[PDB]
Design an enzyme around this catalytic site. Structure first.
Site, short mmCIF file in Angstrom:
data_model
loop_
_atom_site.label_atom_id
_atom_site.label_comp_id
_atom_site.label_asym_id
_atom_site.label_seq_id
_atom_site.Cartn_x
_atom_site.Cartn_y
_atom_site.Cartn_z
N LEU A 27 24.49 117.60 80.06
CA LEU A 27 24.73 118.03 81.40
C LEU A 27 23.50 118.50 81.99
CD1 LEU A 27 28.17 119.87 81.38
CD2 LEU A 27 27.71 117.43 82.22
N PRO A 28 23.33 118.55 83.28
CA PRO A 28 21.99 119.13 83.79
C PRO A 28 21.80 120.58 83.47
CG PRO A 28 22.93 117.69 85.59
CD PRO A 28 23.89 118.06 84.39
N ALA A 29 20.61 120.85 83.47
CA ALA A 29 20.08 122.34 83.02
C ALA A 29 20.70 122.70 81.73
CB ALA A 29 20.87 123.17 84.03
N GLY A 31 18.32 122.27 79.18
CA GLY A 31 16.83 122.37 78.20
C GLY A 31 16.64 120.76 78.01
N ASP A 109 14.57 110.61 78.72
CA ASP A 109 15.20 112.03 79.30
C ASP A 109 15.88 111.76 80.60
OD1 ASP A 109 15.47 114.66 79.92
OD2 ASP A 109 13.48 114.96 80.82
N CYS A 139 25.98 123.42 76.03
CA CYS A 139 25.94 124.92 76.36
C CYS A 139 26.96 125.12 77.62
CB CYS A 139 24.67 125.41 76.72
SG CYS A 139 24.72 127.11 76.91
N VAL A 152 13.49 126.88 86.19
CA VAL A 152 12.74 125.50 86.29
C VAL A 152 13.24 124.54 87.44
CG1 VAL A 152 11.57 125.30 84.12
CG2 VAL A 152 14.02 124.39 84.50
N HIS A 238 -13.37 135.07 64.59
CA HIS A 238 -13.78 136.33 63.65
C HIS A 238 -14.87 136.86 64.46
CE1 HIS A 238 -17.05 133.31 63.18
NE2 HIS A 238 -16.27 132.41 63.06
N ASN A 244 -23.63 133.03 62.14
CA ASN A 244 -23.74 132.63 63.43
C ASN A 244 -25.16 133.02 64.18
OD1 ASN A 244 -20.30 134.04 63.95
ND2 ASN A 244 -21.08 131.83 63.66
N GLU A 307 -12.05 127.43 58.17
CA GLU A 307 -12.80 126.65 59.40
C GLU A 307 -12.94 125.18 58.61
OE1 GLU A 307 -13.20 125.98 62.06
OE2 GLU A 307 -15.18 126.33 62.90
N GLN A 373 -13.76 128.56 64.94
CA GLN A 373 -13.97 127.47 66.07
C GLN A 373 -13.01 126.42 65.92
OE1 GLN A 373 -17.65 127.45 69.05
NE2 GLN A 373 -18.02 125.97 67.38
N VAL A 375 -10.91 125.54 64.07
CA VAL A 375 -9.39 125.63 63.60
C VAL A 375 -8.75 126.02 64.99
CG1 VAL A 375 -7.88 127.21 62.66
CG2 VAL A 375 -9.54 126.21 61.50
C1 GV2 Z 1 15.72 126.31 70.27
N1 GV2 Z 1 16.29 124.90 70.33
C2 GV2 Z 1 16.62 124.01 69.30
C3 GV2 Z 1 17.06 122.97 69.79
C4 GV2 Z 1 17.40 123.46 71.34
C5 GV2 Z 1 17.86 122.65 72.07
C6 GV2 Z 1 17.95 123.03 73.54
C7 GV2 Z 1 17.54 124.34 73.77
C8 GV2 Z 1 17.65 125.09 75.04
C9 GV2 Z 1 16.48 125.31 75.54
C10 GV2 Z 1 16.48 125.86 76.83
N2 GV2 Z 1 15.20 126.42 77.39
C11 GV2 Z 1 14.84 126.41 78.79
C12 GV2 Z 1 15.29 125.36 79.56
N3 GV2 Z 1 14.94 125.17 80.71
C13 GV2 Z 1 13.89 126.09 81.26
C14 GV2 Z 1 13.32 127.15 80.38
C15 GV2 Z 1 14.04 127.17 79.00
C16 GV2 Z 1 13.26 128.37 78.19
O1 GV2 Z 1 13.03 128.25 77.10
N4 GV2 Z 1 12.95 129.37 78.87
C17 GV2 Z 1 12.33 130.45 77.99
C18 GV2 Z 1 10.89 130.26 77.79
C19 GV2 Z 1 10.44 131.54 77.10
O2 GV2 Z 1 10.68 132.83 77.63
C20 GV2 Z 1 12.11 133.00 77.88
C21 GV2 Z 1 12.70 131.81 78.56
C22 GV2 Z 1 17.78 126.03 77.61
C23 GV2 Z 1 18.82 125.49 76.79
N5 GV2 Z 1 19.98 125.71 77.75
C24 GV2 Z 1 21.17 125.26 77.02
C25 GV2 Z 1 21.27 124.58 75.92
N6 GV2 Z 1 19.82 124.70 75.13
C26 GV2 Z 1 18.73 125.02 75.69
C27 GV2 Z 1 16.92 125.08 72.67
C28 GV2 Z 1 16.65 124.49 71.41
O1 F6P Z 2 -16.86 121.10 65.34
P1 F6P Z 2 -18.14 121.78 65.68
O2 F6P Z 2 -18.24 121.97 67.14
O3 F6P Z 2 -19.33 121.69 64.97
O4 F6P Z 2 -17.66 123.44 65.48
C1 F6P Z 2 -17.40 123.87 64.15
C2 F6P Z 2 -18.51 124.83 63.54
O5 F6P Z 2 -18.15 126.06 64.12
C3 F6P Z 2 -18.50 126.98 63.37
O6 F6P Z 2 -17.22 127.75 63.15
C4 F6P Z 2 -19.45 127.86 63.93
O7 F6P Z 2 -20.64 127.29 64.34
C5 F6P Z 2 -18.83 126.32 62.19
O8 F6P Z 2 -18.47 127.28 60.97
C6 F6P Z 2 -18.18 125.04 62.12
O9 F6P Z 2 -18.81 124.12 61.34
#
Ligand code: GV2
Ligand code: F6P
Length: 431
Positions: A27-29, A31, A109, A139, A152, A238, A244, A307, A373, A375
């Site tokens: 259903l709508p709403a 997630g 969707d 739900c 939303v 870091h 650096n 890194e 960087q 990572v």
């Molecule tokens: C954790 N998880 C694993 C599977 C899954 C499926 C649906 C949902 C899910 C996620 C969900 N979340 C949202 C939906 N629309 C708008 C926003 C959210 C939402 O996550 N809001 C939060 C964002 C973070 O801060 C708090 C509020 C709403 C749902 N409502 C009914 C049933 N399922 C919902 C969560 C799930």
């Molecule tokens: O992908 P780039 O831009 O070279 O950045 C990665 C580099 O950045 C640093 O974290 C910092 O210069 C290095 O340790 C690493 O090689």
């Protein structure tokens, strides 16, 4: 003979499985769109090309602005024809994406609340050789539904000429338009042969039936790790380190004097943020660990947060790399995501080892990740839905905390500079 390809370092011989349609259901709403988007963000970041086809966006393009829920009435013969044609047009695009554009997963969707509508998507899948995997969100808690609507629905384009109260009201009746003909997935009987997960009460409970392949089991695993509780994710590097100051990459040097001032500043920042149960993660490199030492909090080290490994170029300046390995310098600048340092890693390699970090991050609430960087870029790309092409060039300055907050369907990023000088290690895309 075998030859080693220049960018990725992959040995190749000298010259001389089904795409999947993921079908949201409910259903709508409930997630469905929240999940569609988040999942698509995870899949693309791990390197499975995935795209959302939201039927609602097709309907919004085919039809003059929305006025009210009467458009969704089951007795509305004409809207029904339009809605059905919107679904078929979305599927045309799904065929195109998966059969011709290199797409791997297409997330359809929509409500898809009737057996009939789903049977037709199956026929579509079956005759294009696509696998079909259903995800249903169930739900019945009005508080959750209300919240979703506030968060939303009322702000969506459909309701731009409506105040809150009357968007909420319209939406509630919109939902009731779907209730009479809603046939939930039924894995006991009529759907026993479909591959599906039925999610109940916001991830509280799952029904999983006939997982066909590794993408599907992995989606289930992902869905069991995510949660919807509010929280904050802080990401930083870091404190500045001795390497650096010398423009040297890699290595395992310690914090410079400014780096230590940062750590101390970071400790102040964290204290002022006033979180509960803030978890702290570092790599196993000294820079990161010294930085966390200043916080006087428990932290845990992860080799995964180390890194990028520059292999044979470890510990050189970029200058020395251009002089000593001119050709390797160029290859990297031309394809910085897939380029593998010799004996070392690519940004692509990084994603693979960071995947378990992302999965655990999804389980956590408040977390501070002190890392490096490349990572940081990789993690940031995940959270902000940045492409592989962009990821190596995202900006992660030293001594600056990136504060990420889940909001609506995505993520706000807020930069917080802790006012300690440092060199700059950012290097623009050059051409
Ligand atoms: C954790 N998880 C694993 C599977 C899954 C499926 C649906 C949902 C899910 C996620 C969900 N979340 C949202 C939906 N629309 C708008 C926003 C959210 C939402 O996550 N809001 C939060 C964002 C973070 O801060 C708090 C509020 C709403 C749902 N409502 C009914 C049933 N399922 C919902 C969560 C799930
Ligand atoms: O992908 P780039 O831009 O070279 O950045 C990665 C580099 O950045 C640093 O974290 C910092 O210069 C290095 O340790 C690493 O090689």
């Amino acid at each position: 003979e075998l030859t080693q390809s220049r960018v990725q370092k992959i040995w190749v011989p000298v010259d001389h499985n089904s795409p999947t349609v993921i079908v949201m259901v409910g259903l709508p709403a409930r997630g469905k769109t929240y999940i569609s988007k988040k999942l698509t963000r995870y899949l693309n970041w791990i390197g499975v090309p995935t795209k959302v086809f939201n039927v609602g966006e097709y309907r919004r393009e085919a039809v003059k602005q929305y006025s009210s829920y009467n458009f969704f009435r089951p007795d509305n013969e004409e809207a029904m024809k339009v809605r059905k044609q919107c679904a078929l047009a979305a599927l045309r695009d799904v065929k195109s994406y998966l059969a011709k554009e290199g797409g791997q997963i297409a997330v359809f969707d929509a409500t898809n609340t009737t057996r009939e509508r789903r049977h037709m998507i199956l026929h579509f899948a079956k005759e294009n050789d696509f696998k079909a995997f259903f995800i249903e969100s169930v739900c019945d808690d009005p508080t959750v539904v209300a919240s979703n609507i506030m968060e939303v629905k009322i702000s969506s384009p459909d309701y731009k000429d409506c105040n809150s109260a009357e968007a909420m009201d319209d939406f509630m009746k919109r939902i009731s338009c779907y209730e009479a003909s809603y046939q939930p997935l039924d894995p006991d009987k009529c759907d026993r042969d479909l591959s599906l997960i039925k999610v109940i009460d916001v991830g509280r409970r799952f029904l999983v039936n006939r997982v066909q392949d590794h993408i599907q089991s992995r989606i289930v695993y992902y869905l069991m790790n995510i949660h919807v509780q509010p929280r904050t994710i802080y990401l930083c590097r870091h404190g500045e380190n001795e390497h650096n100051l010398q423009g040297r990459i890699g290595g395992d040097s310690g914090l410079s004097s400014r780096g230590k001032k940062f750590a101390s500043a970071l400790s102040k920042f964290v204290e002022e943020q006033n979180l509960k149960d803030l978890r702290v993660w570092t790599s196993q490199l000294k820079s990161t660990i010294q930085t966390a030492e200043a916080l006087r909090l428990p932290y845990e080290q992860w080799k995964a947060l180390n890194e990028i490994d520059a292999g044979v170029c470890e510990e050189l300046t970029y200058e020395e790399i251009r002089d000593t390995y001119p050709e390797e310098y160029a290859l990297r600048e031309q394809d910085k995501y897939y380029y593998r340092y010799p004996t070392g890693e690519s940004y692509q390699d990084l994603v693979q080892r960071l995947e378990p970090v992302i999965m655990e991050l999804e389980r956590q609430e408040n977390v501070l990740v002190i890392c490096h960087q490349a990572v940081l870029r990789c993690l940031l790309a995940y959270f902000l839905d940045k492409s592989a092409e962009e990821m190596p060039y995202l900006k992660c300055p030293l001594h600056t905390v990136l504060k990420l907050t889940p909001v609506a369907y995505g993520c706000r990023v807020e930069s917080i500079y802790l006012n300690v000088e440092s060199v700059c290690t950012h290097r623009e895309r050059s051409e």
